[PDB]
Amino acid sequence: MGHSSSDPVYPCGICTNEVNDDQDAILCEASCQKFFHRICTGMTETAYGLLTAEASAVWGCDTCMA
């Protein structure tokens, strides 16, 4: 998701503002496939770095998790 030749710039599932190319983005891979600013989720930069590096790990939105 978000790697095609024709993706729109995606709005953050929390703040509605665009998740730009120079911002950390996190994709909900639980189900929804919504994008979010890392900042908006509350995830630390270190946690984001570790989670994005691990092939067997994905992130889930607070909605999807409930």
Place this chain on the structure above:
Amino acid sequence: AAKVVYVFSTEMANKAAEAVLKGQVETIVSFHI
């Protein structure tokens, strides 16, 4: 071909990172009992 992935909430991602930083576990998917 099927694969198991582990799904982390923000809380769990942050907690897992703390566990790695505290040298309690090797990686954020180093689950244990």
